[PDB]
Amino acid sequence: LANKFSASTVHLEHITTALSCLTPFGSKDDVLIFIDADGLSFVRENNHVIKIQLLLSRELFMSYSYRNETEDHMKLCVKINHILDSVSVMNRNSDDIVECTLSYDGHGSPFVLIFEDSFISERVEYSTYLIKDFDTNGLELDRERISFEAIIKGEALHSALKDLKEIGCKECYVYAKTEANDENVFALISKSQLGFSKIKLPSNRSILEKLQVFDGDSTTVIDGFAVIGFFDFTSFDKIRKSTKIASKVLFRMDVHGVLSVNILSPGIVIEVCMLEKESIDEAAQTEIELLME
Amino acid sequence: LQLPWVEKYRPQVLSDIVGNKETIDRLQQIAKDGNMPHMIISGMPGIGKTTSVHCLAHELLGRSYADGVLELNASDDRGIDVVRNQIKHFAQKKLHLPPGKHKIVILDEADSMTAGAQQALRRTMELYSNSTRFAFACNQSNKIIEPLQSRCAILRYSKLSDEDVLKRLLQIIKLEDVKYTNDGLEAIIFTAEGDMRQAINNLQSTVAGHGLVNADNVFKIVDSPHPLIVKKMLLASNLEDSIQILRTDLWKKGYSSIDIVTTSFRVTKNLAQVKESVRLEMIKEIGLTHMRILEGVGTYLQLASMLAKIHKLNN
Amino acid sequence: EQSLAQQPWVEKYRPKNLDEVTAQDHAVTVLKKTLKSANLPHMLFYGPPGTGKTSTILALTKELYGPDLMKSRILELNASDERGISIVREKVKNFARLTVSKPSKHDLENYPCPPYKIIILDEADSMTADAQSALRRTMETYSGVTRFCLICNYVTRIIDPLASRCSKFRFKALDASNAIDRLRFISEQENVKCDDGVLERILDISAGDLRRGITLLQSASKGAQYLGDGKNITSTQVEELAGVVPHDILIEIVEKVKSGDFDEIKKYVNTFMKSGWSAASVVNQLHEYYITNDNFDTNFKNQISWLLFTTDSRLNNGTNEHIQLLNLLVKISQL
Amino acid sequence: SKENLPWVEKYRPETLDEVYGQNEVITTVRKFVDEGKLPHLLFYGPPGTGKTSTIVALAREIYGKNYSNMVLELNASDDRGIDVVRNQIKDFASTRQIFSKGFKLIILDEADAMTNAAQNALRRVIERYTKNTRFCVLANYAHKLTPALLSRCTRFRFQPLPQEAIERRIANVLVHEKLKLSPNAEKALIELSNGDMRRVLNVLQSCKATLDNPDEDEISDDVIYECCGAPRPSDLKAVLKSILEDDWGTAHYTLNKVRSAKGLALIDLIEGIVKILEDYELQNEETRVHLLTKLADIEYSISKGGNDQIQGSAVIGAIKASFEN
Ligand SMILES: Nc1ncnc2c1ncn2[C@@H]1O[C@H](COP(=O)(O)OP(=O)(O)OP(O)(O)=S)[C@@H](O)[C@H]1O
Ligand SMILES: Nc1ncnc2c1ncn2[C@@H]1O[C@H](COP(=O)(O)OP(=O)(O)OP(O)(O)=S)[C@@H](O)[C@H]1O
Ligand SMILES: Nc1ncnc2c1ncn2[C@@H]1O[C@H](COP(=O)(O)OP(=O)(O)OP(O)(O)=S)[C@@H](O)[C@H]1O
Ligand SMILES: [Mg+2]
Ligand SMILES: [Mg+2]
Ligand SMILES: [Mg+2]
């Protein structure tokens, strides 16, 4: 095509899945679209405290053309409510839709979404907006100062998130500890109306594939030390939709209080970065210690 | 980093709180006795109400402060549902405390609570007064509904005197090893107008700015309270003097006309020397000028005309 | 021919380009040179009714963008639209943040196409103070892609921060000295035959409003065409169409006031108000008569000037014309 | 890109060294950041004195060029109700820094537009999280701020811009552009600025536009008056002289001619005459009272429209009657 970027596919599950994953970040706000030869990424940020990035790779599209030469990537911003409404009306007859193509022609042009059916094609153009000065790359995991890492199965994490949500969890604490004889302890401690509750993942290579505590440098493994991360549930719960489709989840917390969740569902890959609370109260610390001991 | 002096030197104990000596002594008596009743603490900003209530709770509950105190303020959710669930569950909690000690529910800025929540608090206080006690903190005691006031002992804090402000300022200076002069401390106290939070903020700003707290150095950053300037302007016996004050001391310093007229109304409300007829006529003229300003004509000419009319009223 | 003759003269002869705008060169020059400098600032047009503010902004937008690009580069809101704080914070903000649309090759070759949009807030003086405050940082933050144009008759209704943010342009009153050429051109285009001095009389009566003068000229032309006698229009007909009290009636009022009898003045005013004369015109004519009269002293002129000012302010407040006129006449009689 | 911007935004200070006319405040804040002891700040002042520019420059100095990542800026164009304070501001203030870059900064520009409930909710947010966060409030009207919020903030007053700072900024703009300004033109520009730099920049841009050949033409006071359509001092002096010495007919004719020569507005003439009379030495004080009252009434009436000729005659009569005392 004559467009700078044009990607067409026959699977409509990827688009709706990505939109559903992005929904928990606000039904009426902005979404950033990054376009490059590797693929197309959707980025959202909330309150400068949490960030989500969902990547659709080149393999997911039956055809993918990126003819831009001056710039190696293209950045645009759209309103999520517009896309949500347009797709909801256009996707009412989900059985008949056969092709879906995205297109873009550089700055100053709309983002074009076309649903192609057997004999009817629907074309919608989304207006673009200036990108806010805030840089989404600011909230990133310092890969040289990982406090701990863990690999978890998607279903168990999704069940834990559902349990936390249903009890009206208000504060969450991620507790990670390692010992000898391959003893691992990964737990989520919730402060809610019920008081203090705990959800502990088993130390087996089917729900907790691996767990490591690196003493805040990613190199030296230390046993007997416990890493505790304090988060507000309003931001922690925003990964529930992503975990619903997730096949594997990788938690990585650094010393700067940044937690990164890598969700793997050819596929959809999601990155969620969140900041930790300023500090933990004495009562919360005492309750957590009593729960874990 | 280093905390600002206002938060760094917040008292931890009742003994370090100055001003309202009788009230603080009563609070210390309650703290050392234990039988704390429902209480309301009212007063102007920055005089130690929050500090006093928190210190009293800490001293009363000792190690049990974490599990025996429930603190809520205007920045938290405090609707009727909160009263129905969180406060109710806290008051129902069975906590073993030393004899004469009770759980404390601190409601800072209680005046802002909604009517429904305040009405709901009545039954909670009636049912759980045996093991729970409420400490309301507010600026306007009348903003708490009468049924709640009926159960509480009232405690009104007065504005701090220059002596107590000077004493605590000297303590802070001794702790910080700050070089100063007497005139500088007098200027700081004069500008504070009885608000100690402002006094400490201005002291820190002056110490940073020049290191030595002099009157000239204090007045370089901190300005004299504009209400006193407005009072001097209004009480001037000559129209020329009033106009000169309005120009040099208020208009040329960037004070907005709306602020000037509002301050003029507030000051005129408390002019004891003037007669009642003159006072009400001045209030009428100030109100007319305020109405003109609100329409968009916020000019120096309107303020000058208001001053001229006030002077006519005086004659 | 009928299609072109299906519009009132005010809309028919609305300026198309900035060259057609008259008597407002002090701002038109800056706006014109902006077409080359491409450095348009935020604008605050203010002035009395019918001086060419809306026409000027429309002509500027047309010259900048053109028939096609304008539809994507212009957002116009006026008093007929909802302009609450929510509107300012959502719709205006969204448009101001919109990316600059790509011009077409024809647009680029035919028009300058500056790289920003324009938001026009006509009758901005009707907006609330809070809504105006909501615009302050929107105007500054997105000045790289958006420029604001506020238009008003009462500049004091614009909050000071907005006036500071906007470069101010005062539109002058259009009178017989600076707007005569445009009116003469309009009359020539319509073949309106009038006696010498009629156009100047119309402009004097309009009192700074060219729209009113054009409407009066159209009314006179319609009357002359209906009569179909071939005679030139006269100043008396223009005065009658404009609602000017005849000189004899004003003289009768003046003699009644000079007599000083309350009952006679009351009866004469009661009979006079039956005709339906607008009190504003009568007050203006009385001011012109008394202030320029050489038979009265300085104290009388000072007192009557203050009385006329008070009466005019009261009338502008929307008061009963009969009561105000009778009070003014009695007061002048007691002088 | 900066070339296309309006001069008011093109010349926005980027560093604290570029902010003029606020030496005391600027020195205090600079040394505070040098010592890393920034308290909660309030910047109170009239329009266009450099409050927003100063706070943005301070944020840039504190956080270098990445201030946008650890600075939360909110103004009147955004909703700032009690729900916003409870959720967004609270969550930002209670979270750790991006890279442990000291403390976070929250800027509440135009905070006088916030509701009482939101301001009340802000008190404990400011107090509790002082260690991790610092608040900056900016205002033009202090009466809209609650007493508690004022008590919690260290106050700094931005005065109207002094003449020397305006001259230095004008010289900087003139060297930046290829523009020449006459001393009388600069004096008139400062006089009409009223301590607002935005007005100076806008009028200078309009004057440059007015020049036929800006590469060589020099801006004179006449150019400034043409661009602003304001009366000249000579016109005001002549009108006042005619009012105070000539008869009613002569004064009326003089006022009409002076106004028709350049299409001057009556309100501008009234303001100029008021400024002139403020320096007059009056031996009778009732004259000042009558002048002020009547001229304020005339200004208020003009603000709502009305008849222009009647208002001008009213000004003449009011001045004459006041000086007849
Ligand atoms: N009586 C006092 N003695 C010593 N320091 C005081 C006193 N009053 C105020 N301060 C200082 O000011 C700070 C604020 O005191 P607070 O008690 O929180 O103010 P406040 O009386 O609660 O005003 P409001 O109602 O909350 S606006 C304290 O942390 C102290 O540093
Ligand atoms: N300067 C002018 N040059 C030419 N025609 C003008 C001029 N001013 C007014 N007119 C005529 O009057 C009509 C109305 O002009 P506008 O630009 O709408 O006046 P206005 O300043 O917008 O009046 P307001 O403020 O809305 S009451 C135009 O369509 C023209 O026919
Ligand atoms: N002190 C100053 N030094 C230099 N330029 C200034 C100064 N103050 C204002 N300016 C100029 O005026 C513009 C506006 O300044 P601001 O700081 O945004 O105004 P302000 O003080 O915030 O007034 P408000 O409250 O927003 S109406 C700046 O971009 C500069 O071009
Ligand atoms: Mg308090
Ligand atoms: Mg118009
Ligand atoms: Mg500002």
Calpha distance C308→C314 (Å, rounded): 10
β-bridge partners, A44: A52
CA distances from residue B115 to B62, B71, B119, B219, D42 in whole angstroms, order as listed:
34, 19, 6, 45, 33
Cβ–Cβ contact B295 with C under 8 A: yes
**Cβ–Cβ < 8 Å for A274, A235:** yes
Neighbours of B238 (CB within 10 A): 10
Q: Which of B9, B42, B47, B198 to mutate to test the pocket of ligand 1 (most atoms within 8 A of CB)?
A: B47
Calpha distance A90→B212 (Å, rounded): 72
- Quick one: D137 and D181 in the same domain? no
3-state SS assignment for residue C6 = coil
- What are the DSSP calls for B106-130, one per residue? EEETGGGS-HHHHHHHHHHHHHSTT
CA distances from residue B255 to B7, B60, C245, D143 in whole angstroms, order as listed:
30, 47, 50, 11
Domain ranges of chain C: 1-174, 175-244, 245-335
CA of B10 to the centre of ligand 1 (A): 7
Please list, in sequence order, all residues whose beta carbon lies within 8 angstroms of the beta carbon of residue B64, skipping any fewer than 6 positions away: B95, B97, B101
CA of C55 to the centre of ligand 5 (A): 7
What would the 3-class secondary structure string for B213-231 be?
Answer: ECHHHHHHHCCCCHHHHHH
Domain ranges of chain B: 1-160, 161-224, 225-315
Choose, out of D223, D257, D313, D324, the residue to mutate when testing the contact with C (most C CBs < 10 Å).
Answer: D313
Domain end among D230, D252, D279: D230
- Quick one: D39 and D183 in the same domain? no
Please list, in sequence order, all residues whose beta carbon lies within 8 angstroms of the beta carbon of residue B189, skipping any fewer than 6 positions away: B162, B165, B166, B169, B199
Half-sphere exposure of C192 (CA within 13 A, CB side): 26
Burial bucket for residue A114 (CB in 10 Å: 0-12, 13-18, 19+)? middle
Calpha distance A23→A15 (Å, rounded): 12
* CA-CA-CA-CA torsion sign (C224, C228, C231, C236): negative
CA distances from residue C319 to B291, C160, C313, C324, D208 in whole angstroms, order as listed:
20, 31, 10, 7, 48
CA distances from residue A152 to A190, A247, B138, B176, C76 in whole angstroms, order as listed:
19, 9, 50, 52, 55
**Cβ–Cβ < 8 Å for D288, C277:** no
Calpha distance B285→B306 (Å, rounded): 6
Calpha distance A48→A136 (Å, rounded): 9
Method: cryo-EM
**Cβ–Cβ < 8 Å for D129, D121:** no
Calpha distance A199→A187 (Å, rounded): 6
**Cβ–Cβ < 8 Å for C119, C166:** no
Buried b (16+ CB within 10 A) or exposed e, A224-259: ebbbbbbbbbbbbbbbbbbbbbbeebbbbbbbbbbb
Calpha distance B238→B247 (Å, rounded): 14
Instruction: Tokens 């039988």: give the residue.
Output: B35
**Cβ–Cβ < 8 Å for A19, A33:** no
What would the 3-class secondary structure string for chain D be?
Answer: CHHHCCHHHHCCCCCHHHCCCCHHHHHHHHHHHHHCCCCCEEEECCCCCCHHHHHHHHHHHHHCCCHHHHEEEECCCCCCCHHHHHHHHHHHHCECCCCCCCCEEEEECCHHHCCHHHHHHHHHHHHHCCCCEEEEEEECCHHHCCHHHHHHCEEEECCCCCHHHHHHHHHHHHHHCCCEECHHHHHHHHHHHCCCHHHHHHHHHHHHHHCCCCCCCEECHHHHHHHHCCCCHHHHHHHHHHHHHCCHHHHHHHHHHHHHHHCCCHHHHHHHHHHHHHCCCCCCHHHHHHHHHHHHHHHHHHHCCCCHHHHHHHHHHHHHHHHHC
Neighbours of B163 (CB within 10 A): 11
Calpha distance D162→D142 (Å, rounded): 22
Calpha distance B45→D47 (Å, rounded): 29
Radius of gyration of chain C (CA): 25
Amino acid at B312: K
Binding annotation of C for ATP: 10, 14, 47-55, 153, 211
**Cβ–Cβ < 8 Å for C10, C52:** no
The CA-based dihedral angle spanning residues B11, B14, B20, B21, taken in that order and rounded to the nearest 10 degrees = -130
Please report, in angstroms and rounded to a whole number, the separation of the first and last CA atoms in chain D: 62
Calpha distance D109→A20 (Å, rounded): 35
Q: Which two tokens stand for residue C52?
A: 């060419």
Q: Do the Cβ atoms of A135 and D68 come within 8 Å?
A: yes
Calpha distance D151→D223 (Å, rounded): 48
**Cβ–Cβ < 8 Å for C305, C274:** no
The CA-based dihedral angle spanning residues B106, B107, B108, B110, taken in that order and rounded to the nearest 10 degrees = -150
The domain tally of chain D equals 3
**Cβ–Cβ < 8 Å for A285, A230:** no
Calpha distance B262→D145 (Å, rounded): 13
Calpha distance B204→B216 (Å, rounded): 15
Where do runs of H (alpha helix) occur along chain C? 9-12, 25-37, 53-64, 70-73, 85-87, 93-97, 105-110, 129-133, 136-141, 160-165, 180-189, 198-206, 210-227, 235-242, 247-259, 262-272, 279-291, 298-316, 321-334
Strands B132-138 and B39-42: parallel
**Cβ–Cβ < 8 Å for C217, C192:** yes
Task: Say whether D52 counts as a known binding-site residue.
Answer: yes
Instruction: Tokens 């014109």: give the residue.
Output: C32
Instruction: Tokens 């104990």: give the residue.
Output: B13
**Cβ–Cβ < 8 Å for A42, A29:** no
Q: Which two tokens stand for residue A165?
A: 């949500």
Instruction: Tokens 């863990």: give the residue.
Output: A150
- Quick one: D119 and D16 in the same domain? yes
- Quick one: D103 and D11 in the same domain? yes
**Cβ–Cβ < 8 Å for C73, C182:** no
Where do runs of H (alpha helix) occur along C6-135? 9-12, 25-37, 53-64, 70-73, 85-87, 93-97, 105-110, 129-133
Choose, out of D96, D103, D131, the residue to mutate when testing the contact with A (most A CBs < 10 Å).
Answer: D96
- Quick one: D6 and D155 in the same domain? yes
- Give the residue among C289, C306, C296 at the shortest CA–CA distance from D316: C306
CA of D52 to the centre of ligand 3 (A): 7
Furthest-apart CA atoms within chain D: distance in Å: 78
Q: Which two tokens stand for residue D28?
A: 């205090």
Calpha distance B33→B28 (Å, rounded): 8
- Quick one: D321 and D286 in the same domain? yes
DSSP assignment letter at C328: H
C323: left (phi over 0), alpha (psi -120 to 50) or beta: alpha
Please report, in angstroms and rounded to a whole number, the separation of the first and last CA atoms in chain B: 60
- Give the residue among B89, B82, B104 at the shortest CA–CA distance from B37: B104
CA distances from residue A156 to A207, A249, C185 in whole angstroms, order as listed:
7, 10, 85
Go through chain D and tell me how many residues it has: 325
Q: Which residues in chain A are immediately followed by a break of C to N over 2.5 Å?
A: 265
CA of A197 to the centre of ligand 3 (A): 53
- Give the residue among C320, C319, C321, C236 at the shortest CA–CA distance from C283: C321
- Give the residue among D174, D187, D180, D185 at the shortest CA–CA distance from D223: D185
Q: Do the Cβ atoms of D151 and B195 come within 8 Å?
A: yes
Which residues, judged by CB distance below 6 Å to any ligand atom, belong to the binding site of ligand 3?
C 161, 164; D 8, 11-13, 19-22, 47-53, 140, 169, 197-198, 201
CA distances from residue D285 to B41, B47, D276 in whole angstroms, order as listed:
52, 46, 17
Q: Which two tokens stand for residue C248?
A: 């004899």
Q: Which two tokens stand for residue D232?
A: 């000249």
| Apex D270 CA angle, D267 and D273, nearest 5 | 150
**Cβ–Cβ < 8 Å for A261, A157:** no
Calpha distance C140→A4 (Å, rounded): 32
CA distances from residue B150 to B141, B142, D305 in whole angstroms, order as listed:
12, 12, 57
Chain B: list its partners (3+ Cβ pairs within 8 Å).
A, C, D
Instruction: Tokens 């809306």: give the residue.
Output: C54
- Quick one: D225 and D242 in the same domain? no
- Quick one: D156 and D55 in the same domain? yes
CA distances from residue C284 to A10, C289, C308, C319, D65 in whole angstroms, order as listed:
79, 9, 9, 16, 64
Please list, in sequence order, all residues whose beta carbon lies within 8 angstroms of the beta carbon of residue B292, skipping any fewer than 6 positions away: B302, D296, D300
| Apex A26 CA angle, A22 and A31, nearest 5 | 55
The CA-based dihedral angle spanning residues B79, B83, B84, B89, taken in that order and rounded to the nearest 10 degrees = 140
CA distances from residue D125 to D70, D85, D91, D121 in whole angstroms, order as listed:
17, 9, 10, 7
- Whether B189 lines ligand 1, by a CB cut-off of 6 Å, is no
What's the domain range around D203? Answer: 162-230
Nearest CA owner, ligand 3 atom 18: D52
Domain end among D108, D138, D161: D161
- What are the DSSP calls for chain A, one per residue? --SSEEEEES-SHHHHHHHHHHGGG-SSSEEEEEEETTEEEEEEEETTTEEEEEEEEGGGSSEEEE---S-SEEEEEEEHHHHHHHHHHHTTTTTT--EEEEEE-STTSPEEEEEE-SS-EEEEEE--BPPPSS-GGGS---TT-EEEEEEEEHHHHHHHHHHHHHTT--EEEEEEEE-STT-EEEEEEEEETTEEEEEEE-SSTTTEEEEEE-TTTTS---SS-EEEEEEEHHHHGGGHHHHHH-SEEEEEEETTSEEEEEEE---EEEEEEEEPBS---HHHHHHHHHHH-
Q: Which two tokens stand for residue B21?
A: 């000596």
β-bridge partners, B19: none
Q: Which two tokens stand for residue A80?
A: 């999520």
Query: Resolution in A, one decimal?
Result: 2.2
- Give the residue among A89, A71, A66, A289 at the shortest CA–CA distance from A196: A289
Please list, in sequence order, all residues whose beta carbon lies within 8 angstroms of the beta carbon of residue C298, skipping any fewer than 6 positions away: D247, D248, D320
Buried b (16+ CB within 10 A) or exposed e, A195-219: ebeebebebeeebbeebbbbbbebe
DSSP assignment letter at C103: P
- Quick one: D188 and D117 in the same domain? no
Calpha distance D286→D290 (Å, rounded): 6
**Cβ–Cβ < 8 Å for C111, C65:** yes
Amino acid at C329: L
Instruction: Tokens 């950045």: give the residue.
Output: A75
**Cβ–Cβ < 8 Å for A233, A171:** yes
DSSP assignment letter at C294: S
- Quick one: D175 and D284 in the same domain? no
Calpha distance B276→B29 (Å, rounded): 45
Calpha distance D139→D145 (Å, rounded): 9
Go through chain B and tell me how many residues it has: 315
Distance of CA D102 to the CA centre of its chain: 34
β-bridge partners, D41: D136, D154
3-state SS assignment for residue C151 = strand
Q: Do the Cβ atoms of A47 and D131 come within 8 Å?
A: no
DSSP assignment letter at B101: -
CA distances from residue D219 to A160, A184, D7 in whole angstroms, order as listed:
73, 79, 17
Domain end among D100, D128, D161: D161
Please list, in sequence order, all residues whose beta carbon lies within 8 angstroms of the beta carbon of residue D115, skipping any fewer than 6 positions away: D80, D81, D82
Name the closest residue on chain D to residue B298, using Cα atoms.
Answer: D300
The CA-based dihedral angle spanning residues D207, D212, D217, D222, taken in that order and rounded to the nearest 10 degrees = -50
Amino acid at A256: H
Q: Which two tokens stand for residue C192?
A: 């309106």
Q: Which two tokens stand for residue B67?
A: 């599990």
Instruction: Tokens 């969620």: give the residue.
Output: A272
Contacts 24+ apart (CB under 8 A), C188-193: C189/C13, C190/C9, C190/C221, C192/C217, C192/C220, C192/C221, C192/C224, C192/C233, C193/C224, C193/C231, C193/C232, C193/C233
